[PDB]
Structure 1
Amino acid sequence: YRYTGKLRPHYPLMPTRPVPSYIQRPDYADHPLGMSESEQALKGTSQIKLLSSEDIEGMRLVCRLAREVLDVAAGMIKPGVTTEEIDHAVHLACIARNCYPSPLNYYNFPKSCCTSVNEVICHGIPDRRPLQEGDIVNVDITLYRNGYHGDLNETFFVGEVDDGARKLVQTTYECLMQAIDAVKPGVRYRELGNIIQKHAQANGFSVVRSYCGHGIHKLFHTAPNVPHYAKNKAVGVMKSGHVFTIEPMICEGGWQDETWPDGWTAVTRDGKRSAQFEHTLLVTDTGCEILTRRLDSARPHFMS
């Protein structure tokens, strides 16, 4: 394999971390290939669930707990800390909150969260590499509680970063927030990508095309599919009671991605840096509720 940038995987991975039997498990947790029966039974479906009142309460709880866990990871972002160490803290924090770490064994993903440094667009596997001053790093958290998944991510700075890293991370966050601001009943899902790309393009940045936002509730990933680029062909119209993510991945150079031989790690083909932010949203009558918001601070971690 020819690597696209400086980053390399740092093996071996510590042995898989068990989840105590008392924590409720998603269907794929024990599947040998980590396949989700409940997901696959709906593969190829455009129909979007309308959440019930109990569904909404279940989503509010898990998305609040997921935010608490992301905040734990944020606290550890410093030079010299390995991504595996982050993952260990995240694993324990999910368990402490009576939650299963959703990524763990999801289609055989080996860890409890995704840590995506510099040119990694997404799905970086936590490993022995110590974080380096100047790095940017996304940690993507999903928890599973009482049958429901809650999903968020943020990009962080490791120590002091250069001007381009600041510009990329700020713009990616702006893209997400501008898209969130457009969410309300009657809006087509395909529209968010127009908003996101317009802002990214205006700042000299490209938009990843291979990975999308997603419906989430009793399923980790389900309808709607939500592209982040312009003139996409997404199917569906927002309605009150829809729950989905917007999770734009934005790049310094081109939009093209490829995957490492591990089958997971998605990287820029040019080896330039990529950043991502994510919230789980509930469409309401006035617009939408940001289920994964911070409750005690106005801003994401990279600002404060």
Structure 2
Amino acid sequence: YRYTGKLRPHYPLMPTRPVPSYIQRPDYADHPLGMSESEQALKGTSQIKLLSSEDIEGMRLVCRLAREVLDVAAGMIKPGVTTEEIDHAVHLACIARNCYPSPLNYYNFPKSCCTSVNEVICHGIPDRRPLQEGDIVNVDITLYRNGYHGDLNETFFVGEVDDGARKLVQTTYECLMQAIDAVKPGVRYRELGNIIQKHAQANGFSVVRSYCGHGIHKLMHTAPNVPHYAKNKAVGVMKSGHVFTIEPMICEGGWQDETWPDGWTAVTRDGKRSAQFEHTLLVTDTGCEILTRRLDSARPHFMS
């Protein structure tokens, strides 16, 4: 394998971390290949669940807990901390909230969060690498509570960063929020990529094509599929009671991606930086509820 940039994996990984049995587990947790029967059973379906009031309560709670765990991770970001140390903290913070760390064993993913540095687009695996001053690092948190998943992510700066890092991360955050601002009943899911791409392209960045936002509730990934680039062909129209994420990945160079031999880590083919932000959203009768928002503080971590 020819690496696309300066990043490398830092092995060995710690043996996988157990979750106590009193924590309720998603189906794939105990499947030998980490397959989710319940997702596979809706593979190829375009139909979007209309959440009940009970379902909405469940999503509100797990998403608030997921935000709390993200905040824990944001607190740890400093030069010299390893990504594995972040993941260990995350793992304990999930268990403390009586939640299962959704990524753990999802299709045999080895860790309890995703940590994506610099040219990593998404799904980086926490490992023994200490964060370096000038890195950008995204932490993606997904929790499972009482049969509901909640999903969010933010990009952080490690110490002082360059102006290019600042612009990339600001633009990516703006892309997400412009999309969110458009969410309401009657909007086609395909429009959001037109919005994102327009803002990315205006700032000289490209938009990853291979990974999309997604429905989420009882399943971690389900309908709708939500592309982040323009002129996509996504199926569906927003209605009150839909829950889904929007999670644009924006790049300094070209949009093309490839995957490391680990089967997870997605990197820019050119080795240039990429940043991401993610929220889980509920469509209401007039607009949307950002389930993973901060309740206590006006701005994402990288501004603060």
1:103-143 deviation per Cα after TM superposition (whole angstroms, max 9, x unaligned):
00000000000000000000000000000000000000000
Looking at structure 1, the residues matched to 38 and 185 of structure 2 have their Cα atoms a distance apart, in angstroms, of: 27
Superposition RMSD on alpha carbons, in Å? 0.2
Aligned-partner SS, 2:280: strand
Looking at structure 2, the residues matched to 102 and 252 of structure 1 have their Cα atoms a distance apart, in angstroms, of: 30
Give the fraction of aligned pairs with identical amino acids, expressed as a percent.
100
Looking at structure 2, the residues matched to 5 and 90 of structure 1 have their Cα atoms a distance apart, in angstroms, of: 27
Aligned-partner SS, 1:70: helix
1:214-237 deviation per Cα after TM superposition (whole angstroms, max 9, x unaligned):
000000000000000000000000
1:263-304 deviation per Cα after TM superposition (whole angstroms, max 9, x unaligned):
000000000000000000000012000000000000000000
1:122 maps to 122
Structure 2 residue 237 is matched with structure 1 residue 233: no
Structure 2 residue 289 is matched with structure 1 residue 289: yes
Matched ranges for 1:136-285 at <5 A: 136-285=136-285
Looking at structure 2, the residues matched to 139 and 252 of structure 1 have their Cα atoms a distance apart, in angstroms, of: 19
1:216-261 deviation per Cα after TM superposition (whole angstroms, max 9, x unaligned):
0000000000000000000000000000000000000000000000
Q: Note the residue ranges of structure 1 that are not aligned, 5 or more in a row.
A: none
Q: Paired residues, what number?
A: 304
Aligned-partner SS, 1:57: helix
Looking at structure 1, the residues matched to 190 and 172 of structure 2 have their Cα atoms a distance apart, in angstroms, of: 18
* Superposed displacement of residue 42, structure 1: 0.2
Structure 2 residue 2 is matched with structure 1 residue 7: no
Matched ranges for 1:86-105 at <5 A: 86-105=86-105
* Superposed displacement of residue 48, structure 1: 0.1
* Superposed displacement of residue 71, structure 1: 0.0
Looking at structure 1, the residues matched to 237 and 265 of structure 2 have their Cα atoms a distance apart, in angstroms, of: 32
* Superposed displacement of residue 3, structure 1: 0.2
Looking at structure 2, the residues matched to 282 and 15 of structure 1 have their Cα atoms a distance apart, in angstroms, of: 36
* Superposed displacement of residue 212, structure 1: 0.1
Looking at structure 2, the residues matched to 187 and 211 of structure 1 have their Cα atoms a distance apart, in angstroms, of: 21
TM, length-normalised to structure 2:
1.00
Looking at structure 2, the residues matched to 263 and 179 of structure 1 have their Cα atoms a distance apart, in angstroms, of: 30
Looking at structure 1, the residues matched to 58 and 129 of structure 2 have their Cα atoms a distance apart, in angstroms, of: 36
* Superposed displacement of residue 96, structure 1: 0.1
The 4+ residue runs of structure 1 with deviation greater than 2 A are: none
Looking at structure 2, the residues matched to 28 and 285 of structure 1 have their Cα atoms a distance apart, in angstroms, of: 34
Q: Note the residue ranges of structure 2 that are not aligned, 5 or more in a row.
A: none
Looking at structure 1, the residues matched to 267 and 170 of structure 2 have their Cα atoms a distance apart, in angstroms, of: 20
Aligned-partner SS, 1:267: strand
TM, length-normalised to structure 1:
1.00
Looking at structure 2, the residues matched to 85 and 15 of structure 1 have their Cα atoms a distance apart, in angstroms, of: 13
Looking at structure 2, the residues matched to 86 and 287 of structure 1 have their Cα atoms a distance apart, in angstroms, of: 35
Looking at structure 2, the residues matched to 269 and 37 of structure 1 have their Cα atoms a distance apart, in angstroms, of: 32
